[PDB]
mmCIF file of C-alpha atoms and ligand atoms in Angstrom:
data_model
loop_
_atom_site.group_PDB
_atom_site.id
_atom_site.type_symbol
_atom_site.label_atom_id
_atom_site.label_comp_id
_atom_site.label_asym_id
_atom_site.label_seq_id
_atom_site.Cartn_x
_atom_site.Cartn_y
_atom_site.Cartn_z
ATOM 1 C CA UNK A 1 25.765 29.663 -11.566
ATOM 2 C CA UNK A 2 26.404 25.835 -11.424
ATOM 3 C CA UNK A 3 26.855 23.158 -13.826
ATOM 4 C CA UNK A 4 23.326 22.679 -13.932
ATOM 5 C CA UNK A 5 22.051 26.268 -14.365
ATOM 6 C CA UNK A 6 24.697 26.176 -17.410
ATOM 7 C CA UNK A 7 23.523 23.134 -19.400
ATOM 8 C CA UNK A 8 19.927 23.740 -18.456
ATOM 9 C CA UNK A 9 20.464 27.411 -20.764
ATOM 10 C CA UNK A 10 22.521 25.741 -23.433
ATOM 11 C CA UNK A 11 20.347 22.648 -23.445
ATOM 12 C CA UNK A 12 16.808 24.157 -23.051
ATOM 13 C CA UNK A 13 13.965 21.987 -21.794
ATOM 14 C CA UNK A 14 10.914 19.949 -23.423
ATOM 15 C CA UNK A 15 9.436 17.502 -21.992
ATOM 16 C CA UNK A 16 7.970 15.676 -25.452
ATOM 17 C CA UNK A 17 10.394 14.031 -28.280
ATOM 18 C CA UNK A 18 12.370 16.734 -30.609
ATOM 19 C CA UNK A 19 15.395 16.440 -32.486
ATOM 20 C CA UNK A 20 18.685 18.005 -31.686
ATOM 21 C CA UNK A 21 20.994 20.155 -33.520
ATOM 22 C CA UNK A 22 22.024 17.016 -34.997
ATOM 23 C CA UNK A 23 18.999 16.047 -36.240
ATOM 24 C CA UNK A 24 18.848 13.150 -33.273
ATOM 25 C CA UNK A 25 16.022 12.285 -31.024
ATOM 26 C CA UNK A 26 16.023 13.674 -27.727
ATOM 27 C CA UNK A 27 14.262 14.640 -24.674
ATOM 28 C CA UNK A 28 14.394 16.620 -21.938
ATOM 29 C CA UNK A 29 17.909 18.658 -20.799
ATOM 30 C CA UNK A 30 19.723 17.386 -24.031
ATOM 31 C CA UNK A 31 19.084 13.409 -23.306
ATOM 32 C CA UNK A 32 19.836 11.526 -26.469
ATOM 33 C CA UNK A 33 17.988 8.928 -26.965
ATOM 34 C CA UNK A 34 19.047 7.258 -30.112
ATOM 35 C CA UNK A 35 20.977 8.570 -33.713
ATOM 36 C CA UNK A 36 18.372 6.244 -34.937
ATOM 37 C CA UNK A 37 16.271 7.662 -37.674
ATOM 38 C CA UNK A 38 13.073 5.562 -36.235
ATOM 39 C CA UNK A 39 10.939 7.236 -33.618
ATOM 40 C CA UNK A 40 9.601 4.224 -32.743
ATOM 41 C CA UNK A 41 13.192 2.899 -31.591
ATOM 42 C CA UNK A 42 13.504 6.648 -29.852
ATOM 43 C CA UNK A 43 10.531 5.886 -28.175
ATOM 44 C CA UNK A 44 11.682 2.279 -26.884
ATOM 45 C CA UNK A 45 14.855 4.096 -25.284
ATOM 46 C CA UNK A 46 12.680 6.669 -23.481
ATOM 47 C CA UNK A 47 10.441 4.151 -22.209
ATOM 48 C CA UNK A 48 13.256 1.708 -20.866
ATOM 49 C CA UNK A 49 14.903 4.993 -19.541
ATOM 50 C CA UNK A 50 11.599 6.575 -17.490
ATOM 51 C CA UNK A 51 10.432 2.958 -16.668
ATOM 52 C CA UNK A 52 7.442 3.212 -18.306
ATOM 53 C CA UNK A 53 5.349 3.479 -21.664
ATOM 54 C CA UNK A 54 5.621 7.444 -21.830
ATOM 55 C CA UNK A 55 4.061 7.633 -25.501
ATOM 56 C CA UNK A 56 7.222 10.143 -26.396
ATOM 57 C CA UNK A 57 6.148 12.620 -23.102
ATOM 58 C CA UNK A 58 7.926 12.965 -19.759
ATOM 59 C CA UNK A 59 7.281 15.022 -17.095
ATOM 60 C CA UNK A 60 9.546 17.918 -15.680
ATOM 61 C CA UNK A 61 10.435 15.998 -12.704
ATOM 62 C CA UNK A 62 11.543 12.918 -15.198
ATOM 63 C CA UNK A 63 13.532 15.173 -17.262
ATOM 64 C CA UNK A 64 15.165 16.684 -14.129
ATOM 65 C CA UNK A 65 15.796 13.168 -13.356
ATOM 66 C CA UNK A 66 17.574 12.197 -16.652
ATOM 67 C CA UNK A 67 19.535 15.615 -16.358
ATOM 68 C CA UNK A 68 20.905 14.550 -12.900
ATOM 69 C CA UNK A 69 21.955 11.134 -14.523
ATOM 70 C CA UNK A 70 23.354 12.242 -17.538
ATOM 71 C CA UNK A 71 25.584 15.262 -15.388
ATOM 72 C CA UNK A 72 26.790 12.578 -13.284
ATOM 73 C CA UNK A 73 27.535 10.014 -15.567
ATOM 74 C CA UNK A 74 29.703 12.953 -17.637
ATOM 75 C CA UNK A 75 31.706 13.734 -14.894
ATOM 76 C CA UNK A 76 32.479 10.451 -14.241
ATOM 77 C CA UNK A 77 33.374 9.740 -17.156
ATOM 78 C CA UNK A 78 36.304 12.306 -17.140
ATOM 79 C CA UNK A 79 37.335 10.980 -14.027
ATOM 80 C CA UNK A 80 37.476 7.530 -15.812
ATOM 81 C CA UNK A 81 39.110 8.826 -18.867
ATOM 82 C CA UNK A 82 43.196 8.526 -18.730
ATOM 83 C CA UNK A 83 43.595 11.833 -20.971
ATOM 84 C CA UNK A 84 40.359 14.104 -19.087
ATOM 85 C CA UNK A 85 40.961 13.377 -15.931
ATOM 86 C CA UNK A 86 44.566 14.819 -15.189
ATOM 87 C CA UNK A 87 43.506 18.359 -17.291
ATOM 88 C CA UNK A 88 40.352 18.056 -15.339
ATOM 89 C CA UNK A 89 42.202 17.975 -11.733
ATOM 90 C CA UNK A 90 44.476 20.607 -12.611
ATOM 91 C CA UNK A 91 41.544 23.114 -13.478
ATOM 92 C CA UNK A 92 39.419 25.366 -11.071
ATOM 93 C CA UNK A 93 35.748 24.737 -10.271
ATOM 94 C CA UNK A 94 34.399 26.974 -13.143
ATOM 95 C CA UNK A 95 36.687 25.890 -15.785
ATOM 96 C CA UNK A 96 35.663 22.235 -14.600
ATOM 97 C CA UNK A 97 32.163 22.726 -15.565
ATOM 98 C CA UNK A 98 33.110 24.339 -19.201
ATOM 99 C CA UNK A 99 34.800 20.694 -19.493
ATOM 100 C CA UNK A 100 31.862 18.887 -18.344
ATOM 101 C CA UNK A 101 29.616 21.102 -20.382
ATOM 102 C CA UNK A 102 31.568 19.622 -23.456
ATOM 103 C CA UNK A 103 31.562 15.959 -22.867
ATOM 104 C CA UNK A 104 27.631 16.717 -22.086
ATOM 105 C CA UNK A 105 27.298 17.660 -26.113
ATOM 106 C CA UNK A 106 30.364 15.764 -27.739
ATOM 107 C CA UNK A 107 30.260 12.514 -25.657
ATOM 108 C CA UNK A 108 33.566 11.954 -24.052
ATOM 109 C CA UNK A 109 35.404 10.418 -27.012
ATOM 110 C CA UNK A 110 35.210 13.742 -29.034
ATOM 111 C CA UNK A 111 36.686 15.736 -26.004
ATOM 112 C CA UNK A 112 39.905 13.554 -25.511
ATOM 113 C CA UNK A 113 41.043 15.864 -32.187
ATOM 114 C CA UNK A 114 41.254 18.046 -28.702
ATOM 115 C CA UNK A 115 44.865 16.858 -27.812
ATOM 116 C CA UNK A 116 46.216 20.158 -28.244
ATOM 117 C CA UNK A 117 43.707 22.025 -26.788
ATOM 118 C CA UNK A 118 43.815 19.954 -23.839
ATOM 119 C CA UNK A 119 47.318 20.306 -23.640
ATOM 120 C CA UNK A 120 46.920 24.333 -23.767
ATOM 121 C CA UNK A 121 44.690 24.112 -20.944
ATOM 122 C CA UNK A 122 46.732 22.070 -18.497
ATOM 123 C CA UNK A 123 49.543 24.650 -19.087
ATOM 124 C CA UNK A 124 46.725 27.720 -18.171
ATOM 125 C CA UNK A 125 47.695 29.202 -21.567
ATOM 126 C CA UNK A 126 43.944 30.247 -21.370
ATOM 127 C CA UNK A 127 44.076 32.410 -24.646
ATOM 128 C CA UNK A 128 46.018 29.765 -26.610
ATOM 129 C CA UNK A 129 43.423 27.381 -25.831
ATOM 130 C CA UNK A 130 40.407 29.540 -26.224
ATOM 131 C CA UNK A 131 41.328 30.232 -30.152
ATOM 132 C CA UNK A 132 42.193 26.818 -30.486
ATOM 133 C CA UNK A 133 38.988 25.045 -28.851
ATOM 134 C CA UNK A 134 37.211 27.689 -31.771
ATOM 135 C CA UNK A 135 39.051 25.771 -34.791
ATOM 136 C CA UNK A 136 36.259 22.796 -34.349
ATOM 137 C CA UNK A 137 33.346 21.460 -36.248
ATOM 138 C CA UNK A 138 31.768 21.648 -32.377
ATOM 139 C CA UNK A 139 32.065 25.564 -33.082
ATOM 140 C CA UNK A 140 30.780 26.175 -36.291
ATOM 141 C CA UNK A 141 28.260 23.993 -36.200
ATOM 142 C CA UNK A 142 27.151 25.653 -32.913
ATOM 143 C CA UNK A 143 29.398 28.372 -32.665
ATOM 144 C CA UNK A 144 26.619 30.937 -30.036
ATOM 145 C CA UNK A 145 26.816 27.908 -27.189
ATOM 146 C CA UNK A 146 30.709 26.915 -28.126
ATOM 147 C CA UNK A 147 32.013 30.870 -27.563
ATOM 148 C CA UNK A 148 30.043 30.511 -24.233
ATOM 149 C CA UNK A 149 32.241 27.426 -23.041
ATOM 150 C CA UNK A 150 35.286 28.772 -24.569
ATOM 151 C CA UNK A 151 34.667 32.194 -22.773
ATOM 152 C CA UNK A 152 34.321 30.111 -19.690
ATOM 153 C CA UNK A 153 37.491 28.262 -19.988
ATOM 154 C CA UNK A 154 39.515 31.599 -21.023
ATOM 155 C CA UNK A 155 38.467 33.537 -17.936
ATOM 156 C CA UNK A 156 37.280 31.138 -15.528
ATOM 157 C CA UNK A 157 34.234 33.085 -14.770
ATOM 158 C CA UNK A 158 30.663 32.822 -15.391
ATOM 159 C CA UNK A 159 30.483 36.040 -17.770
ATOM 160 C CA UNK A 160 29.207 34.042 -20.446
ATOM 161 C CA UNK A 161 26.097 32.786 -18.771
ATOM 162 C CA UNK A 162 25.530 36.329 -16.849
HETATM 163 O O1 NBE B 201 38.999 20.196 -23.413
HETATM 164 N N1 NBE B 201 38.287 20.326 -22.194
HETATM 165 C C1 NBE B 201 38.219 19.311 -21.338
HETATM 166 C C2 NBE B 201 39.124 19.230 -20.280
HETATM 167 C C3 NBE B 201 39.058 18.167 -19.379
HETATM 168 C C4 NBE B 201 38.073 17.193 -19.536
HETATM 169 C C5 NBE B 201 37.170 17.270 -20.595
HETATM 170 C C6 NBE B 201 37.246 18.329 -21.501
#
């Protein structure tokens, strides 16, 4: 298990336009592509994000392609965020990807109403954190993929994901 087998089972894959849990176009691994109710305007940010008029389809190799963006850009992210990065630093390598896992569905802002979760984790008060990470919209609205991250960052092993 990696970061990418992990979000490629809790994101799926389909390689034509759907909505997410949200209701929100998407393609792909879980690539937004607009909260915009218009398909049309979804479509527009898929074309301008493939490079070319892909009539709401991409191909597995594209989506792969988005996927390796989108991991990338989430990690950095952390790195760039003053509150992520120092609980990021101070975890192991599979506790690291439950974080990046998260800012992959909430966006980066969400993860850093966390405060005190955050704060449980940089102290490795892993059961602390796990039941407070669970006291979320993020798990009751999806509350079969959430207890899979927060298993991850209680035991810092892949049990979750077999
Ligand atoms: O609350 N988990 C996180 C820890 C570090 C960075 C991002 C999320």
């Amino acid at each position: 298990m990696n970061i990418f087998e992990m979000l490629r089972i809790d994101e799926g894959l389909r390689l034509k336009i759907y909505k997410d849990t949200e209701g929100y176009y998407t393609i792909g691994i879980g690539h937004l592509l607009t909260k915009s109710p218009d398909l049309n305007a979804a479509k527009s940010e898929l074309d301008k994000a493939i490079g070319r008029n892909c009539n709401g389809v991409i191909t597995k190799d594209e989506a792969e392609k988005l996927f390796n963006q989108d991991v990338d850009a989430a990690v950095r992210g952390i790195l760039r965020n003053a509150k992520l990065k120092p609980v990021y630093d101070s975890l192991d390598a599979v506790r690291r990807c439950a974080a990046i896992n998260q800012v992959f569905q909430m966006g980066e802002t969400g993860v850093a109403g966390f405060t005190n979760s955050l704060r449980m984790l940089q102290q490795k008060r892993w059961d602390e954190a796990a039941v407070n990470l669970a006291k979320s919209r993020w798990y009751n609205q999806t509350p079969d993929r959430a207890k899979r991250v927060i298993t991850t960052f209680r035991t810092g092993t892949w049990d979750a994901y077999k």
